[PDB]
């Protein structure tokens, strides 16, 4: 069935952009639905960042909006994340999830295995 297994570099240095890639396998990303990046801080607190719908409409979390951006690809069934100006407390585990693009009924059905991003010397 539909599965999502992301990957990326988790050794980013402070004050440079990060990179996160999610490889949606089993279902095309341009058919429908909305694709999300969720991260949980150390302390089990979860925060929501931004969405890439099946169309090219996009909104972000207002807190992270000034330094976040979501992309995608068509030939490769992937959608990425470029978040620059990384501060000290951006370390977390970033998750990949699928939800509907309508509000309400914005619940996440399939989730990614997760990956660890650390910001340190």
């Amino acid at each position: 069935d539909v599965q999502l297994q992301e990957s990326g570099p988790g050794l980013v240095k402070p004050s440079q952009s990060l990179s996160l890639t999610c490889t949606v396998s089993g279902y095309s990303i341009t058919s429908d639905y909305a694709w999300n990046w969720i991260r949980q801080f150390p302390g089990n607190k979860l925060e929501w960042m931004g969405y890439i719908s099946y169309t090219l409409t996009t909104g972000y979390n207002p807190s992270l909006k000034s330094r976040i951006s979501i992309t995608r690809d068509s030939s490769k069934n992937q959608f990425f994340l470029q978040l620059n100006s990384v501060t000290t407390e951006d370390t977390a585990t970033y998750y990949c999830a699928r939800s509907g693009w309508l509000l309400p009924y914005w619940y996440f059905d399939v989730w990614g295995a997760g990956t660890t991003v650390t910001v340190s010397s």
């Binding site: 341009t30 719908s53 099946y54 169309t55 090219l56 409409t57 068509s74 693009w101 309508l102 509000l103």
Partner: peptide
Amino acid sequence: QIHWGNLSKIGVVGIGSASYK
């Protein structure tokens, strides 16, 4: 900006989207 919420009520549902250079 195409508000997909209101077009869905009148039956208009986006079926495909892309970008051109």
